[PDB]
Every structure is written in C-alpha cells, then in structure tokens.
C-alpha cells in the first residue's frame, strides 16, 4: 500500500530517534580492570577496600565507588524499565522498517530493464 | 492506506472519531423522536 520514498523516511526517523534515545540511556561498564603491584608480599596483602579506601558495597559499584572518608520507588524504577523498552522497539520498528525496504527495493530492481537470465553479464550502454 | 503516526496525532484522530460517534448518536436520536411525532 505504500511507496519506497515514505518507508525510507520513516526508518530514518527511527534511526536518529534511536540514536538520541540510546544517548540518554545509561549503561553499566563491563571492562576488565587490573592493578600493577610492586612485590609478592604487597600482592598478597592487596584488598580492594584498602586500594580504593572504600567499603565492600562501594567496591561492587565500579561507576561511583566513593571513598570512605567522602562518605563520612517501584513506579520510578518501573519507569526506568520502560524507557529501555521504548528504545528496544525503536530498534524493533527500525529492523521491521528495514525489512520492508529491501523487498520494495527488490521488486523495483526486478522491474528494472535488464537481461535477467539471475542477471546475465552485460555491459550497459 | 497505511501510515505510522506520532503520539500527538493519534490523540487527535482518537478524539475526532469520538466526536463523530457522539455526533451521529445525537443526530441519530433526534430523527426517531420527530419520526415518532
């Protein structure tokens, strides 16, 4: 029922609506993380509580591990779940808008004037 | 035909449908009353 020009436009809405939405979203870090220590005895006595000067809780949170001296809602977190899901169906819509486009491109390509043996090898004049 | 709509429009389209059903309802009731008379 729809033309190619329209579909190309609406996906391009979702792509940048995706880019903006993802930019707002915060994501936890997953990088690996290694410390260079001087000798074996300093290596063995190592403990994260000492190294950062943080408690066991602030060790677990790598993003905002506040030092100890520095230390010295369902509906809300429910809403955090959705925001991640609207960006998720912005993705799902985008791939679905992506999907219909090649079919529309393919039919136009098939309608194109050509040898169409599968396309026979032929230089176009 | 098929189109995908933004949030603001669908509220507009939802209401104008609500108007027309009420408008037909109010107009549809008036006719039998005068027809009954």
């Amino acid at each position: 029922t729809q033309d190619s020009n329209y579909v190309r436009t609406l996906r391009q809405i979702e792509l940048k609506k995706l880019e903006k939405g993802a930019k707002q979203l915060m994501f936890k870090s997953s990088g690996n993380h290694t410390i260079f220590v001087d000798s074996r005895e300093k290596m063995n006595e190592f403990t994260p509580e000492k190294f950062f000067n943080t408690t066991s809780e602030m060790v677990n949170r790598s993003e905002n591990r506040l030092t100890k001296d520095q230390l010295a809602k369902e509906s809300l977190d429910k809403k955090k779940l959705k925001k991640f899901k609207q960006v998720k169906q912005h993705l799902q819509r985008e791939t679905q808008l992506k999907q219909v486009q090649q079919r529309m491109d393919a039919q136009r390509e098939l309608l194109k004037k050509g040898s169409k043996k599968k396309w026979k090898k032929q230089r176009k004049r | 035909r098929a189109v995908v709509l933004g949030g603001d429009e669908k509220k507009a389209r939802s209401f104008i449908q609500k108007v027309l059903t009420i408008s037909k309802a109010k107009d549809s009731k008036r006719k039998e009353q005068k027809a009954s008379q």
Binding site: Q89, R93, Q96, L97 | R1, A2, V4, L5, R13
Partner: peptide
Amino acid sequence: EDEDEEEVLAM
C-alpha cells in the same frame, strides 16, 4: 480520509 487510513507499528 482518516477512515481510509489504518495505523501500524502502534506505540
């Protein structure tokens, strides 16, 4: 013309 229309990808 809105009747001619049908919505898709509802969100």
